[PDB]
Each structure stands twice: as C-alpha cells, then as structure tokens.
Amino acid sequence: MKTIFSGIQPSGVITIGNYIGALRQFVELQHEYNCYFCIVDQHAITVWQDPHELRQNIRRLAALYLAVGIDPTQATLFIQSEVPAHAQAAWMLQCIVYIGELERMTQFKEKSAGKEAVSAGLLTYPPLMAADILLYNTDIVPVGEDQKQHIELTRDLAERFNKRYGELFTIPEARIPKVGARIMSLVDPTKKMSKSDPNPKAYITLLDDAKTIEKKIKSAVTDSEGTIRYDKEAKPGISNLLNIYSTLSGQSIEELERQYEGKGYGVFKADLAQVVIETLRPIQERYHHWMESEELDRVLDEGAEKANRVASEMVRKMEQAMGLGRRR
Amino acid sequence: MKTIFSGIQPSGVITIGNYIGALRQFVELQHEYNCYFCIVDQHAITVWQDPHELRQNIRRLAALYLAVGIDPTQATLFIQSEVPAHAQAAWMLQCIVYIGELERMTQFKEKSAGKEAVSAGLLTYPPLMAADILLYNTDIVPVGEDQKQHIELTRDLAERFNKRYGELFTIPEARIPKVGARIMSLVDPTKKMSKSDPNPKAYITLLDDAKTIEKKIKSAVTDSEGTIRYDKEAKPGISNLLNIYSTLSGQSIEELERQYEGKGYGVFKADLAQVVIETLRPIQERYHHWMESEELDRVLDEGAEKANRVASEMVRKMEQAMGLGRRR
Numbered sequence: 001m002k003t004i005f006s007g008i009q010p011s012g013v014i015t016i017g018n019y020i021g022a023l024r025q026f027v028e029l030q031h032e033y034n035c036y037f038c039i040v041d042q043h044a045i046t047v048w049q050d051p052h053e054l055r056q057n058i059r060r061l062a063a064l065y066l067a068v069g070i071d072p073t074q075a076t077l078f079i080q081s082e083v084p085a086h087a088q089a090a091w092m093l094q095c096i097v098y099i100g101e102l103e104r105m106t107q108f109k110e111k112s113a114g115k116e117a118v119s120a121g122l123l124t125y126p127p128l129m130a131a132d133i134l135l136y137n138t139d140i141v142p143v144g145e146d147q148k149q150h151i152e153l154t155r156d157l158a159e160r161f162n163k164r165y166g167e168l169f170t171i172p173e174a175r176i177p178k179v180g181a182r183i184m185s186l187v188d189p190t191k192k193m194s195k196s197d198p199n200p201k202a203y204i205t206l207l208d209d210a211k212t213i214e215k216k217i218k219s220a221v222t223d224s225e226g227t228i229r230y231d232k233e234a235k236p237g238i239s240n241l242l243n244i245y246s247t248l249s250g251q252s253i254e255e256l257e258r259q260y261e262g263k264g265y266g267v268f269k270a271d272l273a274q275v276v277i278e279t280l281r282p283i284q285e286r287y288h289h290w291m292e293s294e295e296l297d298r299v300l301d302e303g304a305e306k307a308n309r310v311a312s313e314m315v316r317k318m319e320q321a322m323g324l325g326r327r328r
Numbered sequence: 329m330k331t332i333f334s335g336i337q338p339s340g341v342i343t344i345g346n347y348i349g350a351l352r353q354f355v356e357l358q359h360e361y362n363c364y365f366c367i368v369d370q371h372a373i374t375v376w377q378d379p380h381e382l383r384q385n386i387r388r389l390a391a392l393y394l395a396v397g398i399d400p401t402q403a404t405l406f407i408q409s410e411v412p413a414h415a416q417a418a419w420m421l422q423c424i425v426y427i428g429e430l431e432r433m434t435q436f437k438e439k440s441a442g443k444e445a446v447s448a449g450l451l452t453y454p455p456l457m458a459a460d461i462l463l464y465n466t467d468i469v470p471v472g473e474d475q476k477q478h479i480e481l482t483r484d485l486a487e488r489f490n491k492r493y494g495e496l497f498t499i500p501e502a503r504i505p506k507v508g509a510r511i512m513s514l515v516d517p518t519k520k521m522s523k524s525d526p527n528p529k530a531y532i533t534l535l536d537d538a539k540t541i542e543k544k545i546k547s548a549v550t551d552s553e554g555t556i557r558y559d560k561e562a563k564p565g566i567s568n569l570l571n572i573y574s575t576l577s578g579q580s581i582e583e584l585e586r587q588y589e590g591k592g593y594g595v596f597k598a599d600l601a602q603v604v605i606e607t608l609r610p611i612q613e614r615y616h617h618w619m620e621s622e623e624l625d626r627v628l629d630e631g632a633e634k635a636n637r638v639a640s641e642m643v644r645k646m647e648q649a650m651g652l653g654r655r656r
C-alpha cells in the first residue's frame with residue numbers, strides 16, 4: 001500500500017483547527033495506508049519555547065494523537081528528535097535549496113513579519129520539513145491548506161535531488177480536505193487559527209475545559225447584521241463559526257442556515273460551544289488515561305525504533321548519491 | 329589536559345596554505361592536548377561537489393592527515409557525516425543564531441559574491457562549524473586567520489546558549505599562527521590561497537608532482553622591480569613567496585633577503601620550487617602507503633566510534649537544556 005507522513009509541532013496544545021484540518025483525517029487514513037505521524041519538536045524550536053513547556057507539550061501531543069484514535073499497531077507515532085536522520089537529511093537538503101526559495105515562503109515572511117532579529121531556523125524550516133516527508137518515500141501528505149506551498153517546495157527539492165544525483169525520492173502529493181482546510185481565528189477572522197497565537201482567545205485547544213470553550217465562542221468576532229448566513233467575504237466571523245459547527249456536527253451549512261432562521265447570534269454561539277464541548281469530551285477522557293501510564297513512553301520507543309530503521313536507510317542512500325562519507 | 333578541535337573540508341586536495349596555516353600545527357599539538365581532527369564533508373557540500381570526486385577527496389584527506397604525522401593513538405581522526413551529532417547540534421544552533429549574524433559573515437558575502445542563486449548551506453555554514461567545535465568542550469581551535477570571525481560567532485553562540493539555557497559549553501579560543509596564517513594565491517596576491525580556486529595555478533596541493541610545482545611557482549605573479557625584499561603593500565606577490573620560503577625552510581625573511589641580494593626572480597623562484605618539492609616528498613610517500621591499505625578505514629572507524637561517544641552525549645545534554653524529546 002501507499003505511504004503517508006504528517007507532522008504537528010509541540011509548540012502548544014493542538015487546536016480544533018489542527019484537529020479539523022489534519023488530525024481527524026489521520027484517524028481515518030491509518031487503516032488504508034502505511035502511516036508515520038510525527039511530533040515535530042525540532043520544528044517547534046524555530047521560535048522560543050520554554051524548555052519545561054516544550055517537554056510537557058511533546059508528551060501531551062503524543063497522548064492526544066492516541067486519544068483521538070491513532071492505533072500504534074496501524075501507524076508509527078514518534079518524536080522527530082529521536083530520529084537523527086531528520087537532522088541529517090535536513091542538512092543535505094538545505095545544501096540544495098536556494099536562499100531565494102526560502103525567502104519567498106509566505107510562512108517565513110509572515111512569521112518574520114515585523115521582527116528585528118529572527119532565528120535562522122525560521123528561514124530554514126522548509127528543508128527540515130522536506131526531509132521529514134522524503135525520508136519515508138511518502139506518497140501522500142495530509143494537511144493543512146497553509147502547508148501547500150511547503151509541500152510544493154518539497155516536490156521541487158525531491159525533483160532537484162533526483163535529477164542532480166539520480167532517482168531516489170518519491171514525489172509526494174498534498175491531501176487537503178475539501179472542508180476545514182483553513183479554520184480561522186475567533187478573534188481575527190482574516191487570519192487562520194494558530195496554537196501559538198499570543199491571544200488564547202484566538203483558538204480552542206483540545207484540552208480546553210467547558211467554561212473556557214463557552215467564553216471563547218462567546219467572544220468570537222462576528223458582525224452587526226444578526227443574520228446566520230454563510231458569506232466568507234461579508235461575514236467572515238459568522239462563516240467560520242458556521243464552518244466549524246458544520247464539520248463537527250455533520251450538518252451542512254445549508255441545514256444550519258435554515259435551523260437558525262429567525263435567530264440569534266447569542267443562541268447560535270451557545271449551541272456551538274456545546275457542540276465543541278461534546279466533541280472534545282471523549283478525547284479528553286482518553287487523554288488523561290495516556291498521560292498517567294508508562295504505556296505512552298513504550299509506544300514512542302517502539303515508534304522511534306521503526307522510524308529510525310526506515311529513515312537511517314534513506315539517509316545512507318542519500319549520502320551515497322551525494323558522495324558523503326564512505327562506501328557502506 | 330585541554331581539548332583541541334579543527335576541521336578541513338574535502339572540497340579538493342589540501343594545499344600548502346592549508347598545511348602552513350593549520351595541519352602542520354596539528355602535528356605538534358597532538359602531544360600536548362586531547363585532539364579531534366575532522367574531515368568536514370557536510371561543510372564541503374555547501375557548494376557543488378561531484379559525488380565520485382567527494383568520496384575520493386574524503387579518503388585522500390584522511391591519508392594526508394596521517395601522512396603528515398597525525399598519530400591515531402594520540403588524536404581522534406574522523407569524518408563529520410559519520411557522527412550524526414554534528415547535524416543534530418547544527419540544527420539546535422541554527423535555531424539560536426540570527427539571520428543578520430549569518431548575512432554579515434565575510435566568508436558568506438565573499439563566496440556568495442556575484443552569484444544569482446546560492447544554496448542555503450552557504451549561509452548556514454557557521455552553525456554547523458559552531459557545532460563541530462562545541463560538541464567536544466573544545467578549549468582551543470587551531471586555524472587559519474580566515475576563520476577568526478567564524479570562531480568569534482561560535483563564542484557568541486556558546487554564550488547565548490549558556491545564558492539562555494544554562495552553562496554547558498566551554499568558550500573556545502582561536503589559535504592562529506604568528507606566521508603563515510594567511511598564505512596568498514600565487515596568481516592573485518590580494519586573495520588567499522584556496523583549494524577550490526577555479527584556477528589550479530592559484531594553489532599548490534600536497535599531491536602536486538615536481539613538474540607541476542615548478543610551473544606553478546614559475547608563473548606566480550610578482551612585480552617589475554626585480555628586488556627580493558619583503559613589502560606586503562608594494563610587493564605582495566614577492567612578499568608571499570618570501571613568506572612561504574621562510575616558514576618551509578626555517579630561514580627568516582631577513583636571511584632570505586640577504587641570501588638573495590643581487591638576484592634574481594628567476595633563480596629565487598626555481599629555488600623555492602625545490603624547497604616545496606623537498607617538503608612534500610616524504611609526505612607523498614607516506615600518503616601512497618595509506619591509500620593502499622585497509623588500515624586507513626580502520627583508523628576512521630575507530631575515530632568515529634570515539635567521536636560518536638563524546639558528541640552524542642553532548643547532544644543529549646543540549647536536548648535536555650532545550651527541552652527537546654524526552655527525559656533520558
């Protein structure tokens with residue numbers, strides 16, 4: 001069967017945006033493909049992370065992967081840094097990527113937008129991501145519409161290495177959901193929801209309690225119209241809320257528009273909070289079970305062992321094509 | 329005792345400039361310090377290298393290290409890529425270095441001077457070099473005057489990591505010879521001799537045969553004065569040749585100025601070629617012995633084993649201070 005790879009950074013607690021855009025689909029995909037799902041801690045430090053907070057966020061992300069239903073016997077779950085090959089292939093790939101290609105990435109221009117001094121990791125993020133994917137001969141990369149351009153560069157890099165040194169890498173293809181590929185911030189409907197947004201009101205984490213989910217949905221930005229109808233350009237806040245309600249409930253935007261005829265932002269909002277709470281409930285319960293067992297560590301040990309087996313062999317192949325080291 | 333680290337890229341065959349500025353001193357230093365001498369193949373690919381040529385240049389550099397007298401029982405000789413920790417600590421360090429710091433490196437501005445599209449590795453060279461050094465708790469770094477600024481940045485990075493995360497790294501100090509820290513190109517006395525200069529006349533490799541050394545010294549650029557006297561500003565070509573003659577023969581510039589009174593660039597040049605030939609003779613003989621034995625591979629295996637032991641433990645410490653991975 002075909003291979004899948006996808007990573008999420010332990011730069012905070014994952015949000016409903018991360019769930020709807022990616023994680024949710026991992027759960028379905030694990031049965032039809034050979035999957036590698038990564039906790040990308042080396043990507044997380046491209047910006048400051050308190051060390052104690054990072055260690056803790058890494059463990060929570062693993063518990064959340066498993067809590068949503070990723071079966072460790074059907075997929076490989078591992079931590080990026082526990083597989084040295086990622087850093088090794090990242091260096092090889094950054095020797096083939098052009099500076100201009102890196103400088104043109106929208107994520108870089110964005111995240112580096114308005115900053116005086118920025119880490120080089122911010123700029124060199126892409127080649128490490130390309131390595132993450134290419135090491136496993138990945139066919140499909142489920143994301144995450146904001147990740148489209150990175151995957152396009154990954155394809156460019158794979159082809160360049162392939163034509164420069166000889167066919168080695170599989171050319172990966174992105175898989176972006178038709179719905180929910182870009183959930184927006186609750187506080188700024190023109191920006192996507194991000195787990196590292198300095199304003200916690202912008203996102204809902206999978207670990208938010210009921211009272212917190214209620215407040216965040218309550219203060220979500222809308223408009224003075226008072227009409228619950230989908231209009232991304234005119235009513236961006238209300239359209240995003242409609243989108244979340246829809247993908248989480250299984251109801252179409254059309255159906256929700258009708259159900260909410262003659263209402264009523266206050267009631268639409270209160271209902272939505274409960275829908276999100278009911279969704280996270282079973283996830284949170286399973287999360288707590290994982291956080292308190294040694295089983296969590298064993299799954300990660302097993303996953304790194306399998307990932308190291310595959311990646312280190314691709315690194316050997318890469319070194320051989322480039323002429324690094326010695327004949328092995 | 330104190331620790332020493334120094335690396336040379338297998339981007340070509342090392343030159344008399346590499347020998348006079350660094351390698352020669354490794355031989356003396358190995359008895360008074362704990363030394364790690366590296367074949368930096370990951371630095372070499374920051375620019376294009378034909379894979380077959382790189383594999384071969386890596387083996388030749390190792391044979392040359394040993395041929396000049398590096399004793400594998402007194403020092404650790406290893407290949408950079410065979411120690412994954414270099415790439416791992418390079419990534420961690422590139423997450424703490426600022427882009428502006430990288431853009432201001434003279435080596436980068438130089439090597440990227442006049443190029444349309446340049447690899448990111450060119451720009452991110454410094455953090456990998458900082459990793460090479462810092463992984464071993466290095467006290468002294470013998471180079472190589474052109475490497476002073478890289479070592480100053482390495483100190484900046486060590487301090488930053490130390491104050492940001494906690495004391496871990498030793499602050500290294502450069503050790504640059506009083507004489508021969510910057511041997512110049514034979515063809516362009518205003519530029520240093522470089523093993524990758526597109527013009528082979530610019531440098532003399534340790535593997536050049538007699539006829540080749542004679543030609544290169546013969547066509548070395550001088551001046552129309554015809555006087556053999558040291559004047560770096562007025563007579564840059566003749567001053568560089570005087571410098572090479574001096575460090576290789578053991579005679580002072582003063583002594584050579586006198587010996588060559590009433591001469592005679594043609595004779596000064598012919599004499600110099602023989603002095604360089606006589607110097608390389610015993611080195612080349614030992615080089616051939618190493619190139620044809622399996623002993624060369626065993627020394628490198630042993631060296632990587634020792635280097636991996638030390639480096640991987642520093643990487644564990646680095647990850648722990650940054651919060652990467654899991655408590656180990």
Ligand SMILES: Nc1ncnc2c1ncn2[C@@H]1O[C@H](COP(=O)(O)OP(=O)(O)OP(=O)(O)O)[C@@H](O)[C@H]1O
Nearest residue numbers: 009011017021022143144181182183193194195196
């Ligand atoms: N608002 C969003 N809507 C749908 N998918 C998203 C959204 N934000 C991120 N994703 C997807 O989530 C995955 C993990 O991305 P990532 O770990 O960078 O999350 P993030 O919230 O954007 O974090 P950070 O703010 O630290 O960058 C990727 O597949 C990504 O495209």
Ligand SMILES: Nc1ncnc2c1ncn2[C@@H]1O[C@H](COP(=O)(O)OP(=O)(O)OP(=O)(O)O)[C@@H](O)[C@H]1O
Nearest residue numbers: 337339345349350471472509510511521522523524
């Ligand atoms: N002209 C020179 N004179 C004295 N030392 C030198 C000279 N060129 C390089 N070195 C020293 O040689 C060592 C190895 O450097 P390196 O491998 O980059 O050599 P290089 O000749 O400059 O190669 P390249 O042209 O590929 O960059 C360092 O210690 C460096 O400072």
Ligand SMILES: NC(=O)[C@@H](N)Cc1c[nH]c2ccccc12
Nearest residue numbers: 005006007008040129132133147
């Ligand atoms: N969302 C992000 O910022 C991605 N860069 C996360 C990521 C890192 N490595 C990956 C490999 C495959 C898919 C996704 C990823």
Ligand SMILES: NC(=O)[C@@H](N)Cc1c[nH]c2ccccc12
Nearest residue numbers: 333334335336368457460461475
């Ligand atoms: N000459 C050069 O271009 C150096 N960057 C070579 C080098 C790579 N790593 C090192 C570590 C210590 C000393 C020197 C080096």
Ligand SMILES: [Mg+2]
Nearest residue numbers: 009146194195
């Ligand atoms: Mg992101």
Ligand SMILES: [Mg+2]
Nearest residue numbers: 337474522523
């Ligand atoms: Mg150089």
Ligand code: NA
Nearest residue numbers: 030033034074
């Ligand atoms: Na599977």
Ligand code: NA
Nearest residue numbers: 358361362402
């Ligand atoms: Na020693």
